[PDB]
Every structure is written in C-alpha cells, then in structure tokens.
C-alpha cells in the first residue's frame, strides 16, 4: 500500500488525481503534515524540497520540479531565453521581450523601439507581469512612454513584449485565440505531450485600430466570459478542441494541425525543457519529481507559432480532466509505485 499527502487544496487537477488514487484501493491519504508519505502533491509556493528523501526506507515523489519556476515566471523566462545559448538572444519563436523594474533593460528596450518607430514599423507592445492575475495588469500600446509610466504605477516587476500585430484569425468572426498544450515530465525526464489541447478563443472581432477594448485582444477564459457579450456563440465556453481546429485548417487553409502548428509546438516544448534539464533533473537525487506544465502559444497569419508563457500549475479543460488525470497516475505516479494505446506523445531527446 502507498501513502500520499495533499498540500494544495486549490488544485483542480490533483484533487482529481487524489480521488483516482483512493479509488485504486492501493493508495492511502495521510494528514498534510505527516512526513511518512510516498507522494507529495505539494503547495504552489515554498514547497519544502529540502525535507524530501530523508525518511528512511520511503521512496518519495513530488509533483513539482524544484527550479521549474524559471520557465514559469514571465520575468524569469525572458532572462532564461536571452542568456541560455541553447535558446539565445536570436531565438526565433519567442517575441522580443524586455524586463523592466519600477537587471533592467529599459535603455535597451527604448533602443530597439527607436529603430522600430523611426523605420515606420509596427510598434505595438504589451506590458505584463507575473504578479498580475485575472488579466488586470495588462497594457497594450504603441507609445513607449505610456507603457513605462504604467509600469511604475504597479509595484511588481514587468515584462514588455512585442505584441503580435498579425495574429491568425478564425473565421467566421475575425477573432483571436491562443493554444494551450499540457506537458507532463516524469521522474526520468521523459517529456509527454498530451494529445489533446485546447484553443481559448475570443468571441469578439479582432480590432487592430483600438487596443483600449482589451476583450478582442485578450483570450483569457475569465475575460471572455466576463466582458464579451458574444461569449459561447461560436463554440461552448470559447474553447475549441483539436478535432475541430484541425478540420478548420484543412477546409480553409488546405493544411493540417500536425503540419502547420504542432511540429513547432513540439520543437518549442522540447527546447525549453531540455534547456533547464541540467538545473532541475532529479535523476540522481534522493527524491524524485514530476510536473505538469501548461504551455501557451500564439499563431500568426503565416502559421508561425510563438511561445507566450509557461504555467507551472495549470488547470485543465473541463471535458479533459478524466483522461489527463488518469494519464498522470499512469505515467508519473504508478511508474514509480506500481499497482497490484497512449494519450501522450513522447517528445524524444
């Protein structure tokens, strides 16, 4: 029999994983502060990694990679991409980004900006922060002075990023979207891409002239339900799944989801996770880690994929919880603690 503890009550994914583990009859849940566990479903913040793997005779597993925050913080991801030669300052799939404090790149940011507007180029940028949730601390603007003055009002560190001014628009609707991919990295550092993703679509016509109405520009599920009056019109909950999206690409653009988009997505996922593997791998450590990631992508009108951000504690689409959470138990948990056709694509390396 196996023992596990729950320390993040707000996790929809691992509330379901915990439920499945009990329904096996071979897993037992202990109090959150009992140290004699096999599996820790850990807290989002300040997980005590230093106390894992010191209980004699217990193989201990945790659902977070210590150090994975560098990929999953906006300011931290920018620094990782600019300073890692595997990714480099020339990385073609990440938008031009700069870290700004209220080190800092404010002078370099204005430098590339000066060359941009002087050359009559598109000069719209979006400033965002990690500490800003619910799509509130976002500003899209083509005036640099307005972006920088906005940053100093807020307290936290910010990232200014080139706003994809030419996004691929779904039809009908002339509407924006982003692609969420779920990625599971097991204790062996196998990278598993869940075969089901989701498009979080805007239910408003994309309007390049006016950035003040953020509803047509921001694809967040909370924002579309809260502000778009056309919410749910074209698809339920502004969520389009891969079968429909692939069928659309075939009918409209005579291409497939696999060819036009998913090859790039797999390339990007692999590049990010292989980059930080030496810093976070638990291969020869006294405890083991797995983690579920949520990658967010943008697609432009040339069918080029851009990475937007990586979420270290993603939720899942409602109609996909059962399949994915079972896959977590299969691939990440039961692989270390065995019990008494695959939904993942293994990205090899």
């Amino acid at each position: 029999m196996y023992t596990f503890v729950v320390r993040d009550e707000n996790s929809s994914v691992y509330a379901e994983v915990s439920r499945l583990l009990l329904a096996t009859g071979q897993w037992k849940r202990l109090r959150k502060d009992n140290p004699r566990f096999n599996l820790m479903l850990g807290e989002r913040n300040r997980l005590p990694f230093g106390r894992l793997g010191h209980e004699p005779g217990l193989v201990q597993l945790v659902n977070y990679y210590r150090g994975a925050d560098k990929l999953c913080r906006k300011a931290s991801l920018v620094k990782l991409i600019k300073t890692s030669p595997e990714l480099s300052e020339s990385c073609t799939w990440f938008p031009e980004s700069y870290v700004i404090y209220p080190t800092d790149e404010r002078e370099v940011f204005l430098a590339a900006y000066n060359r941009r507007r002087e050359g009559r180029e598109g000069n719209v940028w979006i400033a965002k922060s990690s500490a800003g949730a619910k799509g509130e601390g976002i500003l899209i603007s083509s005036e640099a002075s307005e972006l920088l003055d906005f940053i100093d009002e807020q307290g936290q560190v910010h990232v200014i990023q080139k706003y994809l001014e030419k996004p691929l628009l779904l039809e009908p609707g002339h509407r924006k979207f982003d692609i969420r991919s779920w990625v599971l990295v097991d204790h062996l550092y196998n990278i598993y891409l869940y075969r089901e993703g989701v498009l979080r679509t805007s239910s408003e016509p994309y309007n390049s002239a006016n950035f003040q109405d953020k509803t047509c520009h921001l694809t967040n599920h909370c924002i579309q339900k809260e502000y778009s009056k056309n919410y749910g019109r074209y698809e339920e909950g502004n969520e389009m799944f891969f079968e429909e999206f692939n069928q659309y690409l075939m009918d409209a653009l005579n291409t497939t989801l696999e060819n036009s988009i998913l090859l790039q997505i797999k390339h990007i996922i692999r590049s990010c996770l292989m980059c930080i593997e030496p810093a976070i791998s638990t291969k020869h450590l006294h405890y083991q880690s797995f983690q579920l990631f949520g990658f967010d992508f943008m697609v432009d009108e040339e069918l080029k994929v851009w990475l937007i951000e990586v979420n270290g504690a993603p939720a899942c689409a409602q109609k996909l919880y059962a399949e994915l959470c079972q896959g977590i138990v299969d691939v990440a948990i039961s692989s270390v603690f065995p019990l008494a056709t695959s939904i993942f694509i293994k990205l090899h390396h």
Partner: protein, 424 residues
Amino acid sequence: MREIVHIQAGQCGNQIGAKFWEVISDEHGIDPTGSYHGDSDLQLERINVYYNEATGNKYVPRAILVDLEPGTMDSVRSGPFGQIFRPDNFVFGQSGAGNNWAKGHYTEGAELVDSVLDVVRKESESCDCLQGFQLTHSLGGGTGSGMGTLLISKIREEYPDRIMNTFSVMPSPKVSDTVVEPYNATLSVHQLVENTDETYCIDNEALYDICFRTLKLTTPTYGDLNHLVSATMSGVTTCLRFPGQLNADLRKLAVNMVPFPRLHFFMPGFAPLTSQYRALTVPELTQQMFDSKNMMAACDPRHGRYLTVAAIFRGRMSMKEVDEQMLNVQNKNSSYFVEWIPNNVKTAVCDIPPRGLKMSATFIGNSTAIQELFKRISEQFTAMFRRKAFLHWYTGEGMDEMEFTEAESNMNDLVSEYQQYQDA
C-alpha cells in the same frame, strides 16, 4: 559498571521474580548453584549487570526478596534455583498484609521496610556504578502493592537520582483473588506516577486470555501466566544483558522513551506465542509483535496513539529484512503513531536467541491506549467507593476516606492527561 539492583515484593512479585532469575540464569549459563557452565563468553560479557561475582567463581543474583509472610519465600528457597540467592537477601515478616494496601504501606510494611533498605544499601554499596533498580510486584495485593510502593518512595529518598523501573501486574476481575484489588491498584498507581521512570503494565486478564486463546491451555494457572511474564522480562532486558547494538544505561533508555514524566506506563508484548518447531519468518515476527493479541496490558493500541515504540529482535536473522518489515507495519499503522515525535519507532537486534526459539521479538510500547487500563481500574474502584464498600479494612489501619478520594482524582487526571495527547 552498570549494575542493576533487583527487588521482588509479595506473593506475585516473588513468584514472577523467581521465574525471571530462572530464565536469565539459563541464558547466562549459571546453574542452580551459581556456577557458570556455559559455552560462550558472550554469556559473561555483561553478567555483572544482574549478578555479583563471589569467590569460587560463583555468580549471585543482585536480588532482594521481600514479603510480609514467609510462605512464598520458603517456596522460592525450595524452588529450582532457590540456592542461587544470597540468604541475607531474604527479608520477611510473619504477619502478612491481608491483601490490604494500608497494611503494606502504613502499618505492617512500615515495621519491615528499614531492614529491606539495609540490604538495598549493602547491594548498592558494592556496585561499581549502580545504574538503577527494578521491582517486580502486583498492584492488587498488600505487600507487593502497598509495601512495594513504600519501598520505592524510600529508595527515591535515599537515591534520588537513580532510575526506578517496575514490572507491575495489574489486577483483573477475571483473574482475581479479592474484591479490594481495585482499591489497592488505584492507591498504588499514584505512587508509580510520581516515583518510577518506567512501569511495565502487565494485565492479568491479558495473560489469561493469551494462555487460553493462543496457547490453548484450557485451565491456566498462575504458573502459566508467570511463564509469559518471565519470558517478557527476559526479552525486555536482553539489550542490557548481552552485547549488541544498544550501548545505553537505564537513564539514556528512559530519556528516549518517556516524553512526559507521568506518561511512563509501558505496554509490553513478545512473539512468538504458539501452542511449534516451525520457523518464524521476519514478516511473521514483526506482524505478531504489533498485534494486540501478543501484548500484555489488555489495551487495543488502535484505540490510542504511540508516543514511542521500541522492538528487540533476538536470533540470527537479516537486519535488512527487519528494517523493511518495520517500515511495512508503520505504514499500515500510520495513524497510530504521533507525528510530532519524529522517528519514534526504534529497533535493536541481539544475535543470541532465548531458550527453545531460533528467533523472537519483544515489543515495548508507550501508547496512550494504556488509558483504557486505568479507566477499567477507576470504574471498578468507583463502583465500590460510591457505597464505601470494604473501606473498613482500610480505615481500621488508620486511613481515612479523603486519601481514597485523592487517589481517585489522581487516576482520573492521569486518564485525562492521556486523552489530551491522543487528540494532539
């Protein structure tokens, strides 16, 4: 160095103590006349813990035998190993204690206690470095119960920084001599709460049930009960008496087993208990050890929580397998260990098995479930005291009801203190 002084008081205390000395004398190679005839110097490496070396290569138990009537000690002196005891260490009176704690503690025992302390002092003075005392007694009679706890108080006065441990037989209505046993036991328990460092609670009903249900003895006798106790005492003291993992005197052992001074009442057990030549695997040994049927306080450990646990394995076996099995029982019993004493389950192995067994295991539990034992006694006490029944036997020896009221409150406080650490 690390000498122990052993005291046995009253009928039960002397009959169990005599069996204890029969058992460990066999393990150490000492014949009924004190001569060594073993085959291994491992038998002698720590022989001084319990035996004095008299010239002529005779080994003499550091044992004192106390009673307020002569009958049981006459039987010991005529027993199998009756000759090994120092004749000067038989201290007895003639009146008896009439199963009366007051006669043992206040009148008859008070007249005899000074001469007992003379012998204690004589044995202590010949110890290179006395590490403490052990007492065997019952709580339900008069001499072991009343005079035994009087002795403990006198020893604490004269030797205030010496460890005092007891093997204490708790009365049960199902294995009972007189109706006043709950009175004597309740009065004694408060003495133990204050003046012992470890008290091994041996419930006579548990011993009886083991003999009847597990050993298939249709009509158990006190002798059958006492074979379980002497075997348990041998196992509990294995690591003091033989070379092995533990380099600990009684104080170090108590320091690590007793987190709160009053909660020092231990639940012992051992394995195997079988009705025979079959080999016991380490899984079987470990599983039986933690089974309530192999424990001797008649308390269900699932009704409380373990503060500390120690287990002693005897025989030639895999240490790696012992570790693996101790981890398996802990995960099955994960609810029943307090999580605020880290690593509170400890094990020790001794290569030398007891007589007749290739391997065995002895269990020492400090569990809050022992409160069930004190609740039983408290109920039986109150059922009579509420009507002041049989009290005249005690007021006739100078006691008044107030001292009974205070003993009742003290026991109910002890129970209450166990309940508070079971809910933490």
